[PDB]
Amino acid sequence: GSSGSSGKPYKCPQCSYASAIKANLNVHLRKHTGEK
Ligand SMILES: [Zn+2]
């Protein structure tokens, strides 16, 4: 196996999380911008 990285541009500023869609990162950040 010789594969590189995922190439996913939209990455979390707090996690190792990445996605191919800006709105998927937007939903992920709603958990970082507030709670309870
Ligand atoms: Zn995150």
Side-chain angles (χ1 to χ4, degrees):
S2 306
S3 305
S5 64
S6 64
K8 285 169 179 180
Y10 304 100
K11 308 196 193 294
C12 181
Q14 298 188 13
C15 316
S16 56
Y17 177 90
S19 199
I21 299 176
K22 193 176 181 180
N24 290 353
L25 179 61
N26 185 315
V27 172
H28 180 88
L29 291 160
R30 290 167 199 191
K31 302 173 181 290
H32 295 306
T33 57
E35 64 173 275
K36 303 189 179 81

